[PDB]
Design an enzyme around this catalytic site. Structure first.
Site, PDB file in Angstrom:
ATOM      1  N   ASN A  13       0.787  -1.235   0.000  1.00  0.00           N
ATOM      2  CA  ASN A  13       0.000   0.000   0.000  1.00  0.00           C
ATOM      3  C   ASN A  13       0.826   1.296   0.000  1.00  0.00           C
ATOM      4  O   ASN A  13       0.276   2.401   0.014  1.00  0.00           O
ATOM      5  CB  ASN A  13      -1.021   0.001   1.145  1.00  0.00           C
ATOM      6  CG  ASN A  13      -0.437  -0.509   2.450  1.00  0.00           C
ATOM      7  OD1 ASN A  13      -0.013  -1.670   2.541  1.00  0.00           O
ATOM      8  ND2 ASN A  13      -0.431   0.345   3.474  1.00  0.00           N
ATOM      9  N   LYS A 215      10.218  -9.438   2.224  1.00  0.00           N
ATOM     10  CA  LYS A 215      10.566  -8.106   2.698  1.00  0.00           C
ATOM     11  C   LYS A 215      10.586  -8.015   4.240  1.00  0.00           C
ATOM     12  O   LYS A 215      11.363  -7.246   4.815  1.00  0.00           O
ATOM     13  CB  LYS A 215       9.632  -7.076   2.040  1.00  0.00           C
ATOM     14  CG  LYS A 215       9.114  -5.966   2.926  1.00  0.00           C
ATOM     15  CD  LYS A 215       7.690  -6.264   3.311  1.00  0.00           C
ATOM     16  CE  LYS A 215       7.100  -5.169   4.131  1.00  0.00           C
ATOM     17  NZ  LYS A 215       5.731  -5.572   4.535  1.00  0.00           N
ATOM     18  N   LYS A 270       5.105 -11.917   8.742  1.00  0.00           N
ATOM     19  CA  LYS A 270       5.285 -10.668   9.484  1.00  0.00           C
ATOM     20  C   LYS A 270       5.442 -10.943  10.971  1.00  0.00           C
ATOM     21  O   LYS A 270       6.314 -10.388  11.634  1.00  0.00           O
ATOM     22  CB  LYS A 270       4.106  -9.714   9.264  1.00  0.00           C
ATOM     23  CG  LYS A 270       3.905  -9.271   7.807  1.00  0.00           C
ATOM     24  CD  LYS A 270       2.831  -8.177   7.695  1.00  0.00           C
ATOM     25  CE  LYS A 270       2.516  -7.819   6.252  1.00  0.00           C
ATOM     26  NZ  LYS A 270       3.693  -7.886   5.345  1.00  0.00           N
TER      27      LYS A 270
END
Ligand code: DCD
Ligand code: DCD
Lengths: 308, 308
Positions: A13, A215, A270
């Site tokens: 985003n 990431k 995450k």
């Protein structure tokens, strides 16, 4: 210069909202929105290391490299990764230089091209898992594959189907030493965009392998190597849910993890990166939305993961 | 730490020899051969800032973006430049890491994505000049220029046709301060790849402009701002000839430029670049071949431009 360090991972985003199109102007407008949230963190006096993801941008570049092989030589995924850093790192540092100058603070920020070592024997090279580029229709995908049997696609959170690539565990951020130097000097560093250009080291020589690193796993690595004060992961979600987590201890989030309480959504990696960072340093990891980043640091919200 | 600073600009033969095709492995090898030469200067103990050109690489990327437009959003020239900075920069920093490690010096190098401000009213924006990408035929150029009315192609040193883009003079390196922080810390810095992504500033906001900047003027400006002790433009050619030119004077080389001694070939901007650096700094500019970089600094061979 006395400020604590926060390593911040931007998510999709930061460039692409829910299935917009990846034209430059759309992405820049998104990145300029993100840059104003990040600036506040700078203004509050934290030293910032900024990373981000890759998905759509490296996907698009590898797609442009297949679609034009007739006209121009086709580049490998790792080289496509490199180009994505150039691109992403360019929007990022341009947007950060403008917010800096929009507050009459001289620009002081860089993007570093970034390599990330991985194990070439990682199982991920036999089992692509990391979705990239555009979304395709179930039927659109089914036939795209029939054409190119090399190509693997998979169903991505229901939103559609997506090309999928190897995603090995990050072992070392090659440019670690320079990054450290840059924050010691109070440069707002942008780096490890898309997780870094995957590479291997094999008797004193580094070479690019075809892959897209996670990431979050890679940013956790960097953050713990830098012995950072915080790790922030920035989503378009307000909280990591299971119920939502606010301030939560390593013990708990750990039990909640091994019981597959995060096994569905995109929160698995995450949560895993927050945990790894807090285990390795004992300092706090945050999972909040790009829109509540300062507030999380301030204790006002988000999922904050803390030592026992 | 005690070393003098040399700002070094690589030419084509760094990535492409003559008549080679621009695929990855070909380009990697050429870079590797240059990393070898540049590492001698680092070993001699100089502080090295590395720059390069862009032409064949950004041209390729722009041709990819054009050719894949039916499938992926085509990106503007300035973005395509940033992508080439990432790719060249990556190749270059990886080769450099490898030479360092080959010689038991742990790596200490980075590529910085760079932006270069220019004047949006430079005459070059309405008179496209800088050749780019691959060579076409008189035949192949007009079809393109007629299926693309607004595509512009021209001849170039007598070898064939090439796309052409605005080549504005560079006013400022945005990341200059961070570059200086970096050499101060003895990091071998690679920046300004192809002259930097051309931008303009107005109202304290930076934005990309569609050009390609001459690599030499931009390094001249970088060296001039850094207060480098040397400016080295590396080529495949061994002297800035017309009579052979060894160590020469500022008074004289200036005259030869005016008596039009480099004017039609491929030296004009290189001598302008050097003249300008030595002129503003009283420091030595060098124009040797890649094969003789150290020797030149070692005051054996080259074109060594010197103040009166
Ligand atoms: S957390 C949680 S329950 N949600 C959905 C409202 C985050 C999108
Ligand atoms: C001048 C030719 N050469 C060596 C003979 C190089 S350009 S490397």
């Amino acid at each position: 210069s006395a400020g604590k360090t926060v390593v911040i991972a931007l998510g999709g985003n930061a460039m692409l909202q829910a299935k917009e199109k990846g034209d430059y102007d759309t992405q820049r407008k998104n990145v300029e929105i993100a840059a104003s949230e990040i600036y506040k963190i700078h203004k509050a006096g934290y030293k910032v290391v900024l990373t981000s993801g890759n998905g759509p941008q490296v996907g698009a570049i590898k797609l442009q490299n297949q679609a034009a092989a007739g006209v121009s030589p086709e580049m490998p995924l790792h080289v496509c990764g490199a180009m994505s850093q150039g691109f992403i790192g360019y929007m990022m540092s341009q947007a950060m230089d403008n917010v800096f100058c929009a507050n009459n603070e001289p620009a002081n920020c860089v993007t570093c091209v970034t390599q990330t070592l991985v194990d070439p024997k990682d199982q991920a090279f036999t089992n692509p898992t990391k979705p990239v580029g555009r979304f395709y229709t179930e039927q659109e995908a089914k036939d795209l594959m029939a054409a190119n049997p090399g190509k693997i696609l998979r169903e991505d959170a229901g939103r559609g189907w997506r090309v999928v690539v190897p995603s090995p565990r990050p072992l070392e951020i090659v440019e670690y030493g320079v990054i450290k130097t840059l924050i010691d000097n109070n440069v707002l560093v942008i780096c490890t965009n898309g997780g870094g250009i995957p590479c291997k080291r094999e008797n004193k020589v580094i070479s690019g392998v075809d892959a897209v690193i996670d990431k979050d796993l890679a940013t956790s690595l960097l953050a713990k190597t830098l012995n950072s004060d915080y790790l922030m992961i920035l989503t378009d979600v307000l909280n990591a849910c299971i119920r939502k987590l606010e301030e939560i201890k390593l013990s708990e989030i750990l039990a909640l993890e091994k019981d597959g309480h995060f096994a569905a959504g995109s929160m698995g990696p995450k949560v895993r990166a927050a945990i790894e960072f807090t285990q390795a340093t004992g300092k706090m990891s945050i999972i909040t939305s790009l829109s509540t980043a300062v507030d999380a640091l301030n204790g006002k919200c988000g999922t904050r993961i803390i030592k026992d």
